[PDB]
mmCIF file of C-alpha atoms and ligand atoms in Angstrom:
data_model
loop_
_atom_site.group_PDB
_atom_site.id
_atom_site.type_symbol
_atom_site.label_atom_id
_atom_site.label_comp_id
_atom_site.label_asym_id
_atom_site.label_seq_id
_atom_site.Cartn_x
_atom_site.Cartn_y
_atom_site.Cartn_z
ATOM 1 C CA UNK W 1 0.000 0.000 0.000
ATOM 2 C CA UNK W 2 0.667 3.661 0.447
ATOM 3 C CA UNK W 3 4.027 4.249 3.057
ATOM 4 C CA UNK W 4 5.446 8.148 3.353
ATOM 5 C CA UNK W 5 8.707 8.321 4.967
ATOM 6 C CA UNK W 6 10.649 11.183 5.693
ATOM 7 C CA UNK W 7 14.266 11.615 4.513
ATOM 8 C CA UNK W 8 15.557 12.277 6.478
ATOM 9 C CA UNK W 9 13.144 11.399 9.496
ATOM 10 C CA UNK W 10 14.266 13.617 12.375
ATOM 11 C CA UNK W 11 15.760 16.861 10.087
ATOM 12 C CA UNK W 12 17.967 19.423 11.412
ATOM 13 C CA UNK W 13 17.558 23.388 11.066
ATOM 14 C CA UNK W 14 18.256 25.302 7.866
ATOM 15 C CA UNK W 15 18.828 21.595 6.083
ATOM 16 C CA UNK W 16 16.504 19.743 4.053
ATOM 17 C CA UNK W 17 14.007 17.018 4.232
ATOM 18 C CA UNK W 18 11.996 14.912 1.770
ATOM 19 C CA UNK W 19 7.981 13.552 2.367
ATOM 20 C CA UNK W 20 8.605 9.993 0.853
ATOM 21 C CA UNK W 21 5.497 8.168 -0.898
ATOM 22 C CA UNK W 22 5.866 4.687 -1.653
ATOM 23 C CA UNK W 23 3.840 2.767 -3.493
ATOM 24 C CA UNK W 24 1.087 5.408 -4.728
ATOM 25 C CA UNK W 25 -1.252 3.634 -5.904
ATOM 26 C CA UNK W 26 -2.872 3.490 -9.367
ATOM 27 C CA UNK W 27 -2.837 7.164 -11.659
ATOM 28 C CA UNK W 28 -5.284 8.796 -9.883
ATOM 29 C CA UNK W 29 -6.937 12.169 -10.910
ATOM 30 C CA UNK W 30 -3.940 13.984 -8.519
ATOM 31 C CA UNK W 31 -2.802 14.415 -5.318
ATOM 32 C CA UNK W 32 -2.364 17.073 -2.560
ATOM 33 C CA UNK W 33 0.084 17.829 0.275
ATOM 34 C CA UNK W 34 -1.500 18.943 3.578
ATOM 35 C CA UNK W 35 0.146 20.529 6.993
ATOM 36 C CA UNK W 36 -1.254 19.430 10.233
ATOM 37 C CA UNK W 37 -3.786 16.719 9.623
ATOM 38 C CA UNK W 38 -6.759 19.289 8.198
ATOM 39 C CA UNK W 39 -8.386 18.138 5.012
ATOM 40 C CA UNK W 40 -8.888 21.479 4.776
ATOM 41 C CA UNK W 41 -7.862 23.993 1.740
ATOM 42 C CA UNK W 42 -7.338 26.221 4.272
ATOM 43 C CA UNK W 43 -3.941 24.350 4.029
ATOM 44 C CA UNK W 44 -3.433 23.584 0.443
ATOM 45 C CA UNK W 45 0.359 23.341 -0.646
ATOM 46 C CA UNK W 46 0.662 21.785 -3.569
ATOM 47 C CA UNK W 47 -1.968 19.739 -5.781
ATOM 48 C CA UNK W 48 -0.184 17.669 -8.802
ATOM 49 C CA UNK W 49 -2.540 16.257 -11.827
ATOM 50 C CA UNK W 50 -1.661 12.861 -13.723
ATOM 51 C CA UNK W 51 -3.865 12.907 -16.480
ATOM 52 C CA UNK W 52 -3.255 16.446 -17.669
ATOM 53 C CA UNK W 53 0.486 16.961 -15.868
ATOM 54 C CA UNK W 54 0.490 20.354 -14.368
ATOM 55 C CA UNK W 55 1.694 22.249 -11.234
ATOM 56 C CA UNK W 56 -1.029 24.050 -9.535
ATOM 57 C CA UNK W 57 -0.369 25.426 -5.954
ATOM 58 C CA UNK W 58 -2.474 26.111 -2.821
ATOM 59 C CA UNK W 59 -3.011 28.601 -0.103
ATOM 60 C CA UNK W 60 0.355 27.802 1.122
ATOM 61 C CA UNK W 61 3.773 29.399 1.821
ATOM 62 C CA UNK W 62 5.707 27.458 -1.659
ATOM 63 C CA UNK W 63 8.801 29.551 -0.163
ATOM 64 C CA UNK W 64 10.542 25.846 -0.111
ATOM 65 C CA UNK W 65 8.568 23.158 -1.001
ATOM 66 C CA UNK W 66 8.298 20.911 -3.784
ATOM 67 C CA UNK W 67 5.681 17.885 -5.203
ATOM 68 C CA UNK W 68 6.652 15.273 -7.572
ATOM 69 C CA UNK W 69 5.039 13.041 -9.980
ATOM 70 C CA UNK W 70 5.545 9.808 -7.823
ATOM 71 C CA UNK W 71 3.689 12.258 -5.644
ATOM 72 C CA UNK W 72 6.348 13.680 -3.151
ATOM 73 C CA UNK W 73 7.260 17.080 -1.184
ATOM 74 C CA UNK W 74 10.596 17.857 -0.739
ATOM 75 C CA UNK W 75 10.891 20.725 1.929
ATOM 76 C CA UNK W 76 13.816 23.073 2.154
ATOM 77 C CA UNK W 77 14.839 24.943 4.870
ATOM 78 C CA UNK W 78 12.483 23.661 7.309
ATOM 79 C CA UNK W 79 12.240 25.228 10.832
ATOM 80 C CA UNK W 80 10.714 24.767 14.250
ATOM 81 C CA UNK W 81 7.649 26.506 12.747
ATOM 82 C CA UNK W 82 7.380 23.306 10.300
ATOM 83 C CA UNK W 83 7.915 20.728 12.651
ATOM 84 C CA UNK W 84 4.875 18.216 13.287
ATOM 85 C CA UNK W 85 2.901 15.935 10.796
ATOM 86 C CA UNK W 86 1.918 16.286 7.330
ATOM 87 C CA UNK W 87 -1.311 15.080 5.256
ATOM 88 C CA UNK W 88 -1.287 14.414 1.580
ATOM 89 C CA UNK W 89 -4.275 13.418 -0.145
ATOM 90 C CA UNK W 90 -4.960 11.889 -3.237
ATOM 91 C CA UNK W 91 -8.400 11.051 -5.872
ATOM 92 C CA UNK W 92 -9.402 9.508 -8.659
ATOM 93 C CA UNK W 93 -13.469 9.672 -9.007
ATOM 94 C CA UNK W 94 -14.092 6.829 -8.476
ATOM 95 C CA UNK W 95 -12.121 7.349 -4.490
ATOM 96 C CA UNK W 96 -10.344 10.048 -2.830
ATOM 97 C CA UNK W 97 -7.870 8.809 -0.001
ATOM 98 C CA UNK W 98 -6.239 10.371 2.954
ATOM 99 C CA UNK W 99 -3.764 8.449 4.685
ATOM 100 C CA UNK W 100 -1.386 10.858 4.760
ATOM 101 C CA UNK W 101 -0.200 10.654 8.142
ATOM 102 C CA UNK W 102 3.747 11.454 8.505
ATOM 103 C CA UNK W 103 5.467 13.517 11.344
ATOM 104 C CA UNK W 104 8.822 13.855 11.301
ATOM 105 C CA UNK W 105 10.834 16.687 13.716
ATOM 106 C CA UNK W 106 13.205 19.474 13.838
ATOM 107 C CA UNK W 107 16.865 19.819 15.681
ATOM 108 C CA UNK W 108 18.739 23.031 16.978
ATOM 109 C CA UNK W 109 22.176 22.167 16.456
ATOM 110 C CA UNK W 110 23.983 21.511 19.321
ATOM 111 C CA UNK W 111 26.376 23.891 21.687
ATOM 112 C CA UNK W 112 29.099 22.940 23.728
ATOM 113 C CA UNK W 113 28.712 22.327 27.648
ATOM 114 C CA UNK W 114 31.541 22.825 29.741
ATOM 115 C CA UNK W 115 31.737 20.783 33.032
ATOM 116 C CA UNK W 116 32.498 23.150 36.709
ATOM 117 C CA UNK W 117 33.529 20.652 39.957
ATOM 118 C CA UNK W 118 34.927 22.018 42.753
ATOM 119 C CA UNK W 119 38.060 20.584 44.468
ATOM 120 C CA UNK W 120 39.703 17.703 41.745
ATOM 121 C CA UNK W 121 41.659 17.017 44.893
ATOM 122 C CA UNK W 122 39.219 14.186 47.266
ATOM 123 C CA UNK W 123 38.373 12.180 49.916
ATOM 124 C CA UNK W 124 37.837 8.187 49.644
ATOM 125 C CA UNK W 125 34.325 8.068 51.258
ATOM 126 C CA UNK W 126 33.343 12.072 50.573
ATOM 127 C CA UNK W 127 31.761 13.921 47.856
ATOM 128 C CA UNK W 128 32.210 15.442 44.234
ATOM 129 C CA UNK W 129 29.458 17.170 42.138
ATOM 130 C CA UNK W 130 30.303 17.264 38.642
ATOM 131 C CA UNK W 131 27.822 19.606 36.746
ATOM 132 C CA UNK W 132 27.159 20.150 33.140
ATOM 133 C CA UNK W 133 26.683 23.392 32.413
ATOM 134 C CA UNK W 134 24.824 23.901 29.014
ATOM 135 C CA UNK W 135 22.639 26.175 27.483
ATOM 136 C CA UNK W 136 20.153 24.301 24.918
ATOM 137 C CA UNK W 137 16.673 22.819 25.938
ATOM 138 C CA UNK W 138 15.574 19.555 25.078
ATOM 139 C CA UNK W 139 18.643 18.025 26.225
ATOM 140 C CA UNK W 140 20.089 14.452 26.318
ATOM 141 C CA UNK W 141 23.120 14.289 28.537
ATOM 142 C CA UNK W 142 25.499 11.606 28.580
ATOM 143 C CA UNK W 143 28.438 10.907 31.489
ATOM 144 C CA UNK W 144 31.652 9.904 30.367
ATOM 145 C CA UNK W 145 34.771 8.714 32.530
ATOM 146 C CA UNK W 146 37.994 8.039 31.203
ATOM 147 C CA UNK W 147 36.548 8.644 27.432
ATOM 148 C CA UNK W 148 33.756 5.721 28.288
ATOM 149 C CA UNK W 149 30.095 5.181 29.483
ATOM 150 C CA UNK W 150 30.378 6.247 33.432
ATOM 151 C CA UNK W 151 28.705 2.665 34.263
ATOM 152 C CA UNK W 152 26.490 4.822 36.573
ATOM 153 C CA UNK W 153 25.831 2.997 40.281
ATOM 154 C CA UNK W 154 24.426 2.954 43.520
ATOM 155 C CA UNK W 155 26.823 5.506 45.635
ATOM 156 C CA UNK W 156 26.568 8.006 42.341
ATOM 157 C CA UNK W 157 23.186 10.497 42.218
ATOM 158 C CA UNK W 158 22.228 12.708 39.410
ATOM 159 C CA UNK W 159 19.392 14.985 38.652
ATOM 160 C CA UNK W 160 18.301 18.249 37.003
ATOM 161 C CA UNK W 161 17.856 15.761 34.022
ATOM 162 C CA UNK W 162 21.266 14.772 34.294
ATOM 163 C CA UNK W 163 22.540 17.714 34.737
ATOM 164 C CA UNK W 164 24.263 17.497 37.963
ATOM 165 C CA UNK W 165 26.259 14.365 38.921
ATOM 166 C CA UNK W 166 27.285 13.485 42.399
ATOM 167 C CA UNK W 167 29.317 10.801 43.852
ATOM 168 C CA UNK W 168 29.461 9.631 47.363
ATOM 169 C CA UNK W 169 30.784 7.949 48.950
ATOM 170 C CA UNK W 170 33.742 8.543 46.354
ATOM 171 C CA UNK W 171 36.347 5.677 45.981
ATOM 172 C CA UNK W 172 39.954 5.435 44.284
ATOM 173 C CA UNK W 173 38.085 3.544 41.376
ATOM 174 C CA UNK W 174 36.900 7.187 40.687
ATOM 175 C CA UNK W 175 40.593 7.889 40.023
ATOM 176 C CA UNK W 176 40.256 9.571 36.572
ATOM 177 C CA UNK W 177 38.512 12.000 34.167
ATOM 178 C CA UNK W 178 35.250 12.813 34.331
ATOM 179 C CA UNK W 179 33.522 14.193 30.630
ATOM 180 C CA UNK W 180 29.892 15.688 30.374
ATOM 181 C CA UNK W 181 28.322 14.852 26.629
ATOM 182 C CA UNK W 182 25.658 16.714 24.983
ATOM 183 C CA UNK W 183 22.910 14.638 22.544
ATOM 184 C CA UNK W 184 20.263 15.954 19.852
ATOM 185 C CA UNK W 185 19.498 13.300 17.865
ATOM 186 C CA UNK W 186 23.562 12.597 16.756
ATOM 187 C CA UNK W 187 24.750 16.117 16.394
ATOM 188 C CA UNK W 188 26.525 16.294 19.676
ATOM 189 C CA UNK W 189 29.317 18.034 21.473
ATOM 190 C CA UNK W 190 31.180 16.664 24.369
ATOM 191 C CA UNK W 191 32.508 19.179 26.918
ATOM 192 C CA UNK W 192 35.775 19.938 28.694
ATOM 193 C CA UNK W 193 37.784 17.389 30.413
ATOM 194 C CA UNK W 194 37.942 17.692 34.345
ATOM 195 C CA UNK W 195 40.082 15.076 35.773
ATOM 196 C CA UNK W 196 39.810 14.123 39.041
ATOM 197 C CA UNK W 197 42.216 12.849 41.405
ATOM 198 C CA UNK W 198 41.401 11.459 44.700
ATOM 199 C CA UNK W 199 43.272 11.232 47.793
ATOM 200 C CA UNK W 200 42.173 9.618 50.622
ATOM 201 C CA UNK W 201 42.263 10.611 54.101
ATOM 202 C CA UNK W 202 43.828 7.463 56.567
ATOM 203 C CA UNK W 203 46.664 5.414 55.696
HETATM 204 C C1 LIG C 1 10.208 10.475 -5.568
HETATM 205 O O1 LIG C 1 10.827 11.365 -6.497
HETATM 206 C C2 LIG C 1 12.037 11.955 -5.936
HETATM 207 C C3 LIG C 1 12.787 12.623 -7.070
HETATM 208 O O2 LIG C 1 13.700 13.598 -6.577
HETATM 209 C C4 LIG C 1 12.956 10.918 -5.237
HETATM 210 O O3 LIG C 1 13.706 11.643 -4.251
HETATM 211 C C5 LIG C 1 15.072 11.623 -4.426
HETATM 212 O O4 LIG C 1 15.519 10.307 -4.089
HETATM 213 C C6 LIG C 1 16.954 10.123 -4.118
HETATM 214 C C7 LIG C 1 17.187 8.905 -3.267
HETATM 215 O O5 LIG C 1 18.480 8.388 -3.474
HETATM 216 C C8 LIG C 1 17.744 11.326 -3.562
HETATM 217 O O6 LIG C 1 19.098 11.209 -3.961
HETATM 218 C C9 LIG C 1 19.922 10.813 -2.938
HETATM 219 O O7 LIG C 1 20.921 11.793 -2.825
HETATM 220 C C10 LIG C 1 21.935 11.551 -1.869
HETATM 221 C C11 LIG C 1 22.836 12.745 -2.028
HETATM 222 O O8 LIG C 1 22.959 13.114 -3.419
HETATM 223 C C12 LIG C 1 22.704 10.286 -2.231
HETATM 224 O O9 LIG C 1 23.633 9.999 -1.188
HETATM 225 C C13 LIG C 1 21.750 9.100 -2.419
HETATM 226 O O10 LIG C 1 22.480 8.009 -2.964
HETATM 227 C C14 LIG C 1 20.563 9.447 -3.335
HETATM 228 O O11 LIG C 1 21.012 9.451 -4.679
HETATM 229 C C15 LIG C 1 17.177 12.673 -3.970
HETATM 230 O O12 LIG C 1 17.877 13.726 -3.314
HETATM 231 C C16 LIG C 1 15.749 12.598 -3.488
HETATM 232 N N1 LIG C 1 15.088 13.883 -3.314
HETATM 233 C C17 LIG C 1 15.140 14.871 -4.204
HETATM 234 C C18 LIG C 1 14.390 16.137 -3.797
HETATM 235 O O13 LIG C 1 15.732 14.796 -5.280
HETATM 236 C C19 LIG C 1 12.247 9.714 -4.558
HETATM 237 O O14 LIG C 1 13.160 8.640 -4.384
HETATM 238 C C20 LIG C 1 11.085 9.259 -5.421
HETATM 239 N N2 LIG C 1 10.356 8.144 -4.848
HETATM 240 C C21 LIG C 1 10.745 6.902 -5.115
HETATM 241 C C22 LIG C 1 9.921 5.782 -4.509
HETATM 242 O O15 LIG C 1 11.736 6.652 -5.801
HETATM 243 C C1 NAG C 2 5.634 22.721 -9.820
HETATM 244 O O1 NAG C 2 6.403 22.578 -11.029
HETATM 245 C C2 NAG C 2 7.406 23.595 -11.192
HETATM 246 C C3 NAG C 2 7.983 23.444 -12.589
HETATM 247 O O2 NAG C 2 6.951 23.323 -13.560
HETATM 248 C C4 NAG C 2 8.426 23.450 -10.077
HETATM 249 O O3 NAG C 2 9.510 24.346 -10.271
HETATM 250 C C5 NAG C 2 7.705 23.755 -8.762
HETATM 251 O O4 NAG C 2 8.608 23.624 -7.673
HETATM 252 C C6 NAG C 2 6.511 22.804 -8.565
HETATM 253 N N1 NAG C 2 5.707 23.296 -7.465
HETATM 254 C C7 NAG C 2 5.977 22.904 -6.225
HETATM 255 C C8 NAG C 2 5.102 23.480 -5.122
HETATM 256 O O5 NAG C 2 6.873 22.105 -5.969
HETATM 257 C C1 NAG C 3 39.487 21.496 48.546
HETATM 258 O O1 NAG C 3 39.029 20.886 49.759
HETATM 259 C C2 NAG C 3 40.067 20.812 50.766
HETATM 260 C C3 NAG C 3 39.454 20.135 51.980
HETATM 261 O O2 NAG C 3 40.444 19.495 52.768
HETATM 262 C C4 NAG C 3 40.610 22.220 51.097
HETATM 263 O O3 NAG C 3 41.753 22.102 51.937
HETATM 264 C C5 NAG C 3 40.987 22.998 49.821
HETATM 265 O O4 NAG C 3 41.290 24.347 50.155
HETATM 266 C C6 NAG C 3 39.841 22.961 48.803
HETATM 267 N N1 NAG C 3 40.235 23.623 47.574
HETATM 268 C C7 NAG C 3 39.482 24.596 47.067
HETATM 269 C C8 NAG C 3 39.979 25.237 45.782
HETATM 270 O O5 NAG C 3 38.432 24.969 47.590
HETATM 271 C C1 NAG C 4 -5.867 14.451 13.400
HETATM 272 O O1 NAG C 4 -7.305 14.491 13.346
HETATM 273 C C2 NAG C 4 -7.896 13.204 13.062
HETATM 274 C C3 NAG C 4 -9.379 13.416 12.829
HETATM 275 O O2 NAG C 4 -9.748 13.030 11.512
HETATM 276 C C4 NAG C 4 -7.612 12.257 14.211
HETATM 277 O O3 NAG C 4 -8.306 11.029 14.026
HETATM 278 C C5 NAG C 4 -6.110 12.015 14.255
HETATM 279 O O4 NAG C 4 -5.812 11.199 15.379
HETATM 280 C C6 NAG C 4 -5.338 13.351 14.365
HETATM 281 N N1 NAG C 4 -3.899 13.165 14.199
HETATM 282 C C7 NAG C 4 -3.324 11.971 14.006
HETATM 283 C C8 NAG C 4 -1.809 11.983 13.871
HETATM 284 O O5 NAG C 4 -3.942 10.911 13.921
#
């Protein structure tokens, strides 16, 4: 049957993106390409004709978009403002079908973090705090130690969405260097490189 995929699914600012239709069925009289769900030509981008080949557009934007003959939207320069699910809709008279229902979503590139702990120098069996300081919302944070996946455990604690990371009771294992890591969807940005070195306290 009818499958739209988006290529790429999950698109990134100022970039590009394609509304896939596979196997459109049988030449119909044409087809149209809908934002948002609304059957509505209140939201008419582009309507293509088989039978008579011709381009005609609708009440909408054509700043960057694009409709094929295997019936298909291409979308430049797409931004947070296009995000969210599209509708395209095609007829014959005989039937006129919908399902059209494709979402795909937007990315902000990515900045770099930048860890802050206080006091590399600690205690076996006292704290450390290592914080990832970022500014970007709709964040996926990743904790790195000694350039691999911080196993994460029972005496560690982190929050303000893994933001903050803190380790008690610490423990010569810890003996190395701690790396925040920033995540869109793969467009990421690791941060600085705080190593910390522990001393303990009895002997
Ligand atoms: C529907 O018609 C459009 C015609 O453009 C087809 O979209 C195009 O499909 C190809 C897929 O490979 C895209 O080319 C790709 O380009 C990248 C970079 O050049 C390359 O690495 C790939 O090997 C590939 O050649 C092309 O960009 C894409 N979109 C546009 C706007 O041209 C689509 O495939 C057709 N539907 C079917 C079922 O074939
Ligand atoms: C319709 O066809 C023209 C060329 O005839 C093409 O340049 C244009 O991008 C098409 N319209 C849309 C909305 O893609
Ligand atoms: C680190 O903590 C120890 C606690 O024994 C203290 O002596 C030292 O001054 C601290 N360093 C800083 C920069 O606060
Ligand atoms: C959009 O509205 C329709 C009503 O026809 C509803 O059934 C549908 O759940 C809504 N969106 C999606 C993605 O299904």
């Amino acid at each position: 049957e009818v499958t739209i995929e988006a290529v790429p699914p999950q698109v990134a600012e100022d970039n590009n993106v394609l509304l896939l239709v596979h196997n459109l069925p049988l030449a119909l009289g044409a087809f149209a390409w809908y934002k948002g769900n609304t059957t509505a030509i209140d939201k008419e981008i582009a309507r293509f004709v088989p039978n008579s080949n011709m381009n005609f557009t609708g009440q909408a934007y054509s700043g960057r978009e694009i409709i094929y003959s295997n019936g298909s939207l291409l979308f430049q320069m797409i931004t947070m403002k296009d995000m969210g699910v599209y509708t395209l809709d095609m007829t014959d008279e005989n039937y006129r079908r919908t399902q059209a229902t494709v979402r795909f979503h937007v990315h902000q590139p990515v900045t770099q973090p930048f860890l802050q702990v206080t006091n590399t120098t600690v205690k076996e069996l006292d704290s450390v705090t290592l914080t990832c300081l970022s500014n970007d919302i709709g964040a996926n944070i990743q904790w790195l130690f000694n350039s691999q996946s911080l196993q994460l455990t029972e005496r560690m604690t982190l929050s303000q969405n893994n933001s903050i990371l803190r380790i008690d009771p610490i423990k010569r294992e810890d003996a190395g260097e701690y790396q925040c890591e920033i995540s869109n969807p793969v467009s990421v940005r690791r941060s600085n490189s705080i190593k910390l070195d522990i001393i303990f306290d009895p002997s």
